[PDB]
Design a binder for this molecule. Structure first.
Ligand SMILES: CC(C)CCC[C@@H](C)[C@H]1CC[C@H]2[C@@H]3CC=C4C[C@@H](O)CC[C@]4(C)[C@H]3CC[C@]12C
Ligand SMILES: CC(C)CCC[C@@H](C)[C@H]1CC[C@H]2[C@@H]3CC=C4C[C@@H](O)CC[C@]4(C)[C@H]3CC[C@]12C
Ligand SMILES: CC(C)CCC[C@@H](C)[C@H]1CC[C@H]2[C@@H]3CC=C4C[C@@H](O)CC[C@]4(C)[C@H]3CC[C@]12C
Ligand SMILES: CC(C)CCC[C@@H](C)[C@H]1CC[C@H]2[C@@H]3CC=C4C[C@@H](O)CC[C@]4(C)[C@H]3CC[C@]12C
Ligand SMILES: CC(C)CCC[C@@H](C)[C@H]1CC[C@H]2[C@@H]3CC=C4C[C@@H](O)CC[C@]4(C)[C@H]3CC[C@]12C
Lengths: 96, 145, 132, 107, 163, 145, 48, 59
């Protein structure tokens, strides 16, 4: 969930009015790169879970977390517009 | 309610993508349809006052001739050609150009434009099939919610 | 040697130096520069009009070469030279040393493009301005 | 196919047929004519030969250099070089053990 | 380069076609690779393989047009002049096919080619139709059957033009 | 004025590229059209003097039969066959070959040539789409200038 | 240039240079038939 | 002018670094390094044979 939130914040932050300028270019680039990496992490861990125990992975995706106003990881992923996470077979299996 | 199905749903998303190619085909055909229609209607009836019937005559037969329904018997009756061969022994020689214009028109519309639409669909389909599948997978949760 | 043409007499020393580099490379056997100048079918100042002794002793001047390269680019390309800035009266003007450098670099750059020496061409291209 | 074909077109090819039959009869029975051709000079022949030999050598040199610039060949050549480097270290170790013996016998 | 018989300006269909019909009005004013030269260029231009192709195409095109008019127009009560011209033309074609069979490659090699088989079918169809008409020229039924066979003849002739 | 648009403009450049395939299709169809037309016109009217009507008869119905308008009722009337089955009880038996020739012809024109034109378009489209896009981008400046 | 400052890159492409009879880089590029330069997104952005 | 010159230098630096990170260049550079390593071993062997002579003459 933290990797998805991090990916969304870095991706939205890299295309923002506060980061435009001739001298700020390379860091901005860095942000996008970092965003992708976090996205990869978010997919990757999930994949590992689906390899180990599909049912326990399903139980983890359905868990409501108190820190983000009591809703699950798929809701966060949809809010973060993570197309890669939503298209994964494990996530699709829990939605179905 | 077809969107919930794994076969019909992505195909619906692909149809919404191909609508721009459909619009491209409509803009290209509109040119040939109004050009041929005004020319053919004027050629068939060169001594008639403009009315609403003139406007329908410009769009009615030109549009339906691109689907294979060729009104050649009706065109033969309207041209006042009394010969057994279709456009011989006519009152005016200019109306004998009516099948030639038509001959160009269906070459432009059926052989050229329809086949280019087939080519555009195949290219567009190959380009946006994976994106349509991913978008359907996001809409699966949206429909569940 | 002194020439009756006022355009040729206005030319600085480094233009004559580039002319010497063109002449020295051109006198070598099977040189493409001699064929390019002969097939160009132009006079000394480069105008497309097709005495003889001046037209041969100073056949590789910089103005004619500029005209040959101008035809090579397109039909209405015409490179503008300003050799009046190399006089001693303009030394007090701010940034004049850059302009004199840039123009000089450009002329040497074109010479290096003609002989297909990429490394020296790249070096003169980076020294000067208007890179793109 | 159209190099060996009769010169005249179809309705008139009958004239060409009677002409070929006349030439065949005059050549086989009469023997009043022969065939003439042109033969290339030795100068142009040796000129073609020199060009072909020079370009053959040029292609072999270019082909050898291109095969030596492949990634597989470079990895193989560096690997053999590292093997030769150990061999040189083995020789070095033999010289080293020889001093060890010499220094031991020197005391 | 072997095509065009080694000449510069002979490049498109129209240039060679224009030079073919008009020999004295396009050949001198064209790039060339007295009776000594004009005759030499004429012998080189008409000795070129492309020129024989152009001559064979034009010949086959006239054959198609003349045979097409013959089958569309009604047959007369005797053997007409156009029928005699077509008879001479197809014998010449038949003799050329026989000459190629006996004196060139071999019978097996000739039959292997699909166009030689088509050539044999078109000559065979014309002779069946011509003898059908010529057996009884005043008979209406013979005229109808002859045009029926010659319909197939025109279909093969226009299909052979694709070669 | 469609060329200024990013959708219609490159497609116009692609249409100009596909015109050579259109020309290839025209050259192949012309062969079948004149062969079948001369044969069919001769078969329908074997005892008629050549006129201008003979020439129109050779090109009129053969060309329009490749677009699906089959003049079988008109062919039935011209063949003088009085039977209820379409080409039975005719005056001449040779005119009963008229539907067979037609049967071959539309197999050659609609099933073979049209579908090969579709195949040529798809191949040509995939080959010259990127070059057409680049050429449109040069023409964008040309139109601006 | 397009990575660093899009607006400043646009300003550079519009600059008229005296050495080539007072016209810009895109005009030179068109005259040089550089298809690669004209198809670039930065150049297309200035043309649009 | 300053912007164009700065970005020209920046592109040349990025271009040089990108060409040095290719696989072919790295294989070629490691190969030359192994060649230089043998050269250093050749120098080492010369110093070794010099001691062999020195130790032989020392007895
Ligand atoms: C316009 C381009 C594509 C080709 C030009 C072909 C046009 C001009 C030709 C083709 C067919 C022709 C028509 C065919 C036959 C006749 C009958 C004659 O008694 C009067 C002229 C008329 C009516 C012709 C007029 C000109 C015509 C329409
Ligand atoms: C391969 C394709 C393009 C074949 C081309 C077919 C063309 C040449 C044919 C098909 C239909 C024909 C037309 C059919 C009928 C008539 C009416 C007649 O009174 C004059 C000729 C005219 C106007 C013909 C002109 C030629 C025509 C347009
Ligand atoms: C190999 C292909 C191209 C040739 C086909 C053979 C053709 C020429 C022959 C074969 C059978 C023939 C038909 C056999 C019987 C009849 C009935 C007669 O009352 C009229 C002629 C007619 C209708 C013949 C016309 C010609 C015919 C169709
Ligand atoms: C030419 C190749 C492709 C196949 C050959 C098939 C041809 C020769 C065949 C197929 C259909 C046949 C026709 C079918 C029926 C009849 C009716 C009969 O009372 C007279 C012959 C006639 C009119 C035939 C003539 C020959 C015919 C046209
Ligand atoms: C898969 C496809 C190719 C099926 C083949 C269909 C063929 C065999 C059929 C379709 C239409 C048929 C023709 C329809 C009508 C007639 C007229 C009749 O008086 C004689 C037979 C004849 C001439 C038929 C011959 C056979 C025919 C050509």
């Amino acid at each position: 969930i933290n990797a998805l939130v991090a990916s969304r914040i870095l991706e939205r932050l890299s295309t923002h009015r506060a980061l435009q300028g001739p001298h700020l270019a390379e860091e901005r680039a860095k942000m996008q790169h970092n965003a992708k990496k976090f996205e990869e992490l978010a997919v990757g861990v999930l994949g590992e879970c689906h390899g180990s125990d599909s049912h326990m992975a399903s139980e983890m995706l359905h868990s409501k977390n108190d820190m983000f106003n009591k809703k699950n990881a798929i809701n966060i992923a949809y809010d973060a517009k993570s197309l890669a996470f939503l298209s994964h077979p494990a996530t699709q299996s829990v939605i179905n | 309610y077809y969107a919930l199905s794994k076969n019909l749903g992505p195909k619906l998303i692909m149809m919404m993508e191909m609508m721009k190619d459909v619009s491209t085909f409509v803009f290209l055909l509109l040119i040939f349809l109004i050009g041929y229609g005004v020319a053919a209607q004027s050629l068939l009836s060169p001594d008639e006052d403009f009315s609403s019937r003139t406007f329908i005559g410009v769009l009615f037969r030109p549009y339906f001739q691109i689907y294979g329904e060729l009104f050649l018997d009706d065109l033969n009756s309207e041209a006042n050609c009394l010969g057994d061969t279709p456009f011989t022994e006519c009152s005016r020689e200019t109306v004998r150009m009516v099948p030639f214009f038509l001959a160009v028109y269906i070459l432009g519309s059926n052989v050229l434009l329809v086949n280019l639409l087939i080519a555009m669909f195949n290219d567009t389909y190959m380009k946006v099939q994976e994106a349509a599948e991913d978008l359907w997978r996001k809409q699966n949760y949206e429909l569940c919610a | 040697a002194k020439t009756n043409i006022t355009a040729l007499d206005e030319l600085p020393s480094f233009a004559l130096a580039i002319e010497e580099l063109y002449k020295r490379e051109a006198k070598k056997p099977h040189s493409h520069v001699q064929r390019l100048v002969s097939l160009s079918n132009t006079d000394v100042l480069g105008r497309h009009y097709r005495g003889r002794d001046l037209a041969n002793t100073r056949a590789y001047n910089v103005l004619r070469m500029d005209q040959i390269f101008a035809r090579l680019v397109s039909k209405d390309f015409s490179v503008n030279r300003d050799f009046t800035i190399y006089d001693s009266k303009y030394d007090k003007v701010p940034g004049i040393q850059f302009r004199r450098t840039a123009q000089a670099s450009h002329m040497l750059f074109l010479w290096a493009i003609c002989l297909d020496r990429f490394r020296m061409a790249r070096h003169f291209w980076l020294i000067g301005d208007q890179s793109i | 196919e159209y190099k060996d074909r009769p010169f005249l077109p179809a309705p008139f090819i009958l004239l060409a047929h009677v002409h070929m039959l006349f030439m065949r009869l005059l050549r086989l029975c009469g023997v009043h004519t022969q065939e003439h051709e042109k033969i290339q000079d030795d100068e142009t022949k040796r000129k073609i030969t020199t060009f072909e030999e020079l370009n053959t050598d040029k292609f072999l040199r270019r082909w050898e250099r291109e095969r030596q610039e492949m990634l597989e060949a470079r990895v193989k050549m560096t690997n053999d070089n590292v093997v030769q480097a150990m061999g040189m270290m083995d020789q070095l170790l033999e010289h080293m053990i020889s001093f060890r013996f010499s220094l031991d016998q020197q005391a | 380069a072997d095509w065009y018989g080694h000449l510069k300006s002979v490049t498109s269909f129209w240039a060679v076609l224009f030079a073919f019909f008009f020999p004295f009005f396009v050949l001198p004013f064209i790039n060339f690779s007295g009776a000594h030269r004009l005759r030499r260029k004429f012998a080189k231009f008409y000795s070129a393989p492309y020129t024989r192709f152009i001559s064979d195409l034009l010949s086959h095109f006239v054959l198609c047009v003349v045979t097409s008019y013959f089958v569309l127009d009604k047959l007369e009560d005797t053997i007409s002049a156009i029928e005699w011209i077509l008879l001479v033309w197809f014998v010449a074609l038949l003799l050329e096919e026989l000459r190629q069979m006996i004196f060139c490659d071999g019978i097996a090699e000739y039959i292997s080619d699909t166009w030689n088989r088509l050539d044999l079918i078109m000559i065979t169809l014309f002779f069946v139709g011509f003898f059908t008409h010529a057996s009884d020229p005043s008979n209406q039924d013979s005229k109808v059957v002859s045009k029926g066979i010659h319909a197939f003849l025109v279909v093969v002739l226009w299909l052979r033009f694709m070669r």
